[PDB]
Design a protein around this ligand. Structure first.
Ligand SMILES: COc1cccc(-c2ccc(C(=O)NC3CCN(CC(F)(F)F)CC3)cn2)c1
Ligand SMILES: N[C@@H](CCC(=O)N[C@@H](CS)C(=O)NCC(=O)O)C(=O)O
Ligand SMILES: [Mg+2]
Lengths: 198, 198
């Protein structure tokens, strides 16, 4: 069973796949491309977008669809059909925000303006809604860790790059961030992975 | 279970759920609202976004996460993990494009411009990709209809209001809509459902 992950040299939307792998102890090759190799590959893929996962000469796309596939009947999945939902909902609420950023804007000031808006106007509200949804439970979904707990910590990672005082009023979020990061197989990948801004 | 789905009087985000309910033949409370009682409601919601589904007072959110949850252990789900990964991928790719529209934009002309240019440049790029992902095959994924075909006809239905000629060069994509529409339960729902623009 053969794994070639394709994406740019960034955590980005691949990091949810790379946390899963290294958690669930599975060998993959981590194929990281140059911004200038991209069009040559972009042309050949059915949907022109990455990440993508090749699974013995089979081509998968859409990080979360993939993420959801590598966790169907595993302990990062929800212990029940309802908890699979909340997981997917939690993930999509975060992707919904993360997906808002003009990541690929080449006009810098125009980009910075848009990033700053969202990080002051929309961010704290998302953090709020999250903390409350967490309330006082140990994980986001049910009684153990799930990949939604991973998406969160990953999304939170990149947001923290751009606005450090973000979780100041949410220790229960810094707690959760940190409790996800201290997991053996997670903790170790965080130590080894390439060191990219994004 | 007792299902209560809450949304506006329209299709938009809730429709994928309504289709699934009809196909699956699941009795459910289809509660629609006018703005009038919106922030009155919005308050009582973990994430203050709709559609939402109450399943015995247990509230669930994210339209796709819910639709998925509702297709779990049916055939609508895709017939194999691998397919289900594809069905998800298409649903996201579809949802990704849709979330690119300024839906609530009240400067009518900025709407028009972006809308028309999104159909101009973005939309036909996704059409060829969908067209050629579909091929001459019957359904988008697998040997049988999955909830990704449902979403295609729901999405393409709404975008066709704004650009009728949208699919005038993708015979095969109009083919897929008709195969979705002629499904008895869906065709029943179609004629039953109330008349709204979107
Ligand atoms: C992990 O937390 C998330 C969740 C969702 C999205 C992202 C995310 C998305 C995009 C990027 C990003 O920076 N993508 C770039 C956009 C610019 N392109 C330039 C291109 F397309 F020309 F190659 C490279 C990929 C980073 N993180 C991160
Ligand atoms: N919903 C998609 C978003 C995928 C996406 O558009 N990825 C970006 C990189 S972050 C991309 O391929 N952009 C470069 C391009 O447009 O070709 C997913 O979850 O994978
Ligand atoms: Mg999405």
């Amino acid at each position: 069973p053969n794994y070639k992950l394709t994406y740019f040299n960034m955590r980005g939307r691949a990091e949810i796949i790379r946390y899963i792998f290294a958690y669930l102890d599975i060998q993959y090759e981590d194929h990281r491309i140059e911004q200038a190799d991209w069009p040559e590959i972009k042309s050949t893929l059915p949907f022109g977008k990455i990440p993508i996962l090749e699974v013995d000469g089979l081509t998968l796309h859409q990080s979360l669809a993939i993420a959801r596939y590598l966790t169907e009947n595993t302990d990062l999945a929800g212990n029940t059909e309802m908890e699979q939902c909340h997981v997917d909902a939690i993930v999509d609420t975060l992707d919904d925000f993360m997906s808002c950023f003009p990541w690929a804007e080449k006009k810098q000031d125009v980009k910075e303006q848009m990033f700053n808006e969202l990080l002051t106007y929309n961010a704290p509200h998302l953090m709020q809604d999250l903390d409350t949804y967490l309330g006082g439970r140990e994980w986001l979904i049910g009684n153990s860790v799930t990949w939604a707990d991973f998406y969160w910590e990953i999304c939170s990672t990149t947001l923290l790059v751009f606005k450090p005082d973000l979780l100041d009023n949410h220790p229960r979020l810094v707690t959760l961030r940190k409790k996800v990061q201290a997991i053996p197989a997670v903790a170790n990948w965080i130590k080894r992975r390439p060191q990219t801004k994004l």
